[PDB]
Amino acid sequence: AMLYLIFYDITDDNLRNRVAEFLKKKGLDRIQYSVFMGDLNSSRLKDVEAGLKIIGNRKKLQEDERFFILIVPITENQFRERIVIGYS
Amino acid sequence: AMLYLIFYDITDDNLRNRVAEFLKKKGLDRIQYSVFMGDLNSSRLKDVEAGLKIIGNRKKLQEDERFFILIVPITENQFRERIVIGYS
């Protein structure tokens, strides 16, 4: 199974919490408030994608509202090469 | 030069705008409100990292404030394999 990184930007608190809860239930590792990672085969990737699409299956109501999820395959080595920047 | 994906979660509007402006000036391609990508060699990666750290060189003032940037190497093929989910 390939490793995936999942990043999201969801302004609605309710929808964001649904996404976080869903990804946790799928067994993905949470690495930041809005970032998860984990291994997914074809079946599990399809389930994740379908669930996330259902959560986003609505219309935006205000121009500054965002709902965006990016799922990208990565390798363990690439993840080890990551740079994380925070307050310092 | 390796391709990088840059995701961030920055609640302060001023700092977020400084990051977006900086990454644009560095020639990275913007792919979402808070996501960029592009090729960086060692020299250019170091400059990007140093600049982003300077922008984050302060102390958080309220518990729900976040400043997080993740830089990860990826390949063009991995990016072509990405899944993007939005409102639908």
Curated annotation (Swiss-Prot), chains A, B:
Coiled coil: none annotated. Changing R16A: Considerable loss of RNase activity. GO terms for biological process: defense response to virus; maintenance of CRISPR repeat elements. It is an enzyme of class 3 (hydrolase). GO terms for molecular function: metal ion binding; RNA endonuclease activity. Its cofactor is Mg(2+). Optimum pH is 8.5-9.0. Its EC number is 3.1.-.-. Changing D9A: Loss of RNase activity. CDD domains: Cas2_I_II_III. Disulfide bonds: none annotated. Mg(2+) binds at D9. Changing R30A: Loss of RNase activity. Keywords: Antiviral defense, Endonuclease, Hydrolase, Magnesium, Metal-binding, Nuclease. Belongs to the CRISPR-associated endoribonuclease Cas2 protein family. Forms a heterotetramer with a Cas1 homodimer. Homodimer. NCBIfam families: cas2. CRISPR (clustered regularly interspaced short palindromic repeat), is an adaptive immune system that provides protection against mobile genetic elements (viruses, transposable elements and conjugative plasmids). CRISPR clusters contain sequences complementary to antecedent mobile elements and target invading nucleic acids. CRISPR clusters are transcribed and processed into CRISPR RNA (crRNA). Involved in the integration of spacer DNA into the CRISPR cassette. Functions as a ssRNA-specific endoribonuclease, producing a 5'-phosphomonoester and a 3'-hydroxy. This is CRISPR-associated endoribonuclease Cas2 1. The lineage of its organism: Archaea, Thermoproteota, Thermoprotei, Sulfolobales, Sulfolobaceae.
